[PDB]
């Protein structure tokens, strides 16, 4: 890495790891389109395994960005429309409150109060159907944004129905493979377990538990190298040869709703560049990010804006991730850690790095 990058990275991340007592960490900086890597600490403390450029981290909700692009790809393929009723792709969902709830609403958390989690008791196909069937909205569709695994998770399960493929097959075939993300997994295969970091929660080694719609909402695992490639692909979607994927990425970065200074895309969230750092740093606190907020519709959606800060935070029990990029500056960061530490600390650090290099 250019010494400019070494300097700000080292000055910023070392204190962060100490303050937050993070066991292990990988960072990628994308500068003028090119990736530069940094690793610290332990993927497995007990077995003294270092974090490397091949270590898999749980991405948590950064997974939603893959889900959004896969949905955008299916739109571009003509398989689905965001204007379509949810019930078009789930005929067994006959509950009357679903009338007027479209795929857009599901993708962008504006259905009317779908909850943050699918309940842990929802295991089977029958349970899943009964959960959505019996759900009663707090608000009308397209009025309030309330961040929800149950909203975008359902979007992702339904977006892949016309293709005949499972969510996992569609993700592999249509996104991971074309982009050469050869070390990104929804399910980590036995040969890769050697590289799968443990997460740490109150000193305990932990991995994400299975739950309904996990793959869609929070279930991807990936390395710092594949995550840099993902950033490169979203920075510059026009270098992508596969046409519907190229469109899908553009669609995931369109602005569908505004709340405050933030715009909701598919998975991705966007703000105009230059940004108020306090706004993205403070707004990342779950006390704000997870509260209901009124949305204004963008009619019709604004196509991907090059002068944007595009980002997503993500967590699991034992992991904390963050991705941010500015297409106009060809500039991005990926931060992957095996402790779930506060969101504002991630955004703060990412801003310091990107602002110095901008
Ligand atoms: C997306 N990213 N982080 C989160 C936390 N949600 C969550 O579902 O955690 C598990 C279930 C372990 C993945 C949330 C913001 C507290 O969701």
Residue whose CA is at the smallest distance from ligand 1 atom 12: 316
Q: Does ligand 1 lie within 6 Å of residue 61's CB atom?
A: yes
The reply to whether 61 belongs to the active site is yes
Ligand 1 atom nearest 208 alpha carbon: 12
SS3 category, 331? strand
Q: Does ligand 1 lie within 6 Å of residue 289's CB atom?
A: no
> 115: exposed, middle or buried (C-beta count within 10 Å: 0-12, 13-18, 19+)?
middle
Q: Does ligand 1 lie within 6 Å of residue 67's CB atom?
A: no
CA 305 to chain centre: 19
d(CA 152, CA 296): 19
Q: Does ligand 1 lie within 6 Å of residue 199's CB atom?
A: no
Tell me which method was used to determine the 3D structure.
X-ray
d(CA 10, CA 272): 28
- The answer to whether 41 and 24 are in contact (CB under 8 A) is yes
Q: What is the CATH number of domain 1-358?
A: 3.40.710.10
- Residue of 218, 337, 343 best suited for mutating to test ligand 1, as the one with most atoms within 8 Å of CB: 218
- Phi then psi for residue 243, to 5 deg, are -65, -50
- Helix, strand, coil shares of the chain as percentages rounded to 5? 40, 25, 35
Element (H, E) at 171: helix 167-171
State whether the Cα torsion 309-115-56-347 is positive or negative: positive
Ligand 1: centre distance to CA 6 (Å) = 31
CA 99 to chain centre: 28
State whether the Cα torsion 71-72-76-78 is positive or negative: positive
Q: Does ligand 1 lie within 6 Å of residue 60's CB atom?
A: yes
Q: Which of 61, 150, 254, 308 is catalytic?
A: 61
d(CA 260, CA 161): 34
For residue 228, give the nearest of 340, 126, 334 by alpha carbon. Answer: 334
Ligand 1 atom nearest 58 alpha carbon: 13
Ligand 1: centre distance to CA 336 (Å) = 15
Residue whose CA is at the smallest distance from ligand 1 atom 1: 61
**What's the Cα-to-Cα distance from 193 to each of 54, 63, 96, 187, 198, rounded to whole Å?**
11, 19, 45, 10, 10
The domain locations on the chain are 1-358
Element (H, E) at 131: helix 125-134
CA 316 to chain centre: 12
Ligand 1 atom nearest 217 alpha carbon: 1
- The answer to whether 196 and 206 are in contact (CB under 8 A) is no
């Amino acid at each position: 890495a250019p010494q400019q990058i070494n300097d700000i990275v080292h000055r910023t991340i070392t204190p962060l790891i100490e303050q937050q007592k993070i066991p292990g960490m990988a960072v990628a900086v994308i500068y003028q389109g090119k990736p530069y890597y940094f690793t610290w600490g332990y993927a497995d403390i007990a077995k003294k395994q270092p974090v490397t450029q091949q270590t898999l981290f749980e991405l948590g909700s950064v997974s939603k960005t893959f889900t959004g692009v896969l949905g955008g790809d299916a739109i571009a393929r003509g398989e689905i429309k965001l204007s379509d009723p949810t019930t078009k792709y789930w005929p067994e969902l006959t509950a009357k409150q679903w009338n007027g709830i479209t795929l857009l609403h599901l993708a962008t958390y504006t259905a009317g109060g779908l909850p943050l989690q699918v309940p842990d008791e929802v295991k089977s196909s029958s349970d899943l159907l009964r959960f959505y069937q019996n759900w009663q909205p707090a608000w009308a569709p397209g009025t309030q944004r309330l961040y929800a695994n149950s909203s975008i998770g359902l979007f992702g399960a339904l977006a892949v129905k016309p293709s005949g493929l499972s969510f996992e097959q569609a993700m592999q075939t249509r996104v991971f493979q074309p982009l050469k993300l050869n070390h990104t997994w929804i399910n980590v295969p036995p040969a890769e377990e050697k590289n799968y970091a443990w997460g740490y929660r109150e000193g305990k080694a932990v991995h994400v538990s299975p739950g309904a719609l996990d793959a869609e909402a929070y279930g991807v695992k990936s390395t710092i190298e594949d995550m840099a490639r993902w950033v490169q692909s979203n920075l510059k979607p026009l270098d992508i040869n596969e046409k519907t994927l190229q469109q899908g990425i553009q669609l995931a970065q369109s602005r569908y709703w505004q709340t405050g200074d933030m715009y909701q895309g598919l998975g991705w969230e966007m703000l105009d560049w230059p940004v108020n750092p306090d706004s993205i740093i403070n707004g990342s606190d779950n006390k704000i990010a997870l509260a209901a907020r009124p949305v204004k519709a963008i009619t019709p959606p604004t196509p991907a804006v090059r002068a944007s800060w595009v980002h997503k935070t993500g967590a699991t029990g034992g992991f904390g991730s963050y991705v941010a990029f500015i297409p106009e500056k060809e500039l991005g960061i990926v931060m992957l850690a095996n402790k779930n530490y506060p969101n504002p600390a991630r955004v703060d650090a990412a801003w310091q790095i990107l602002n110095a290099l901008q």
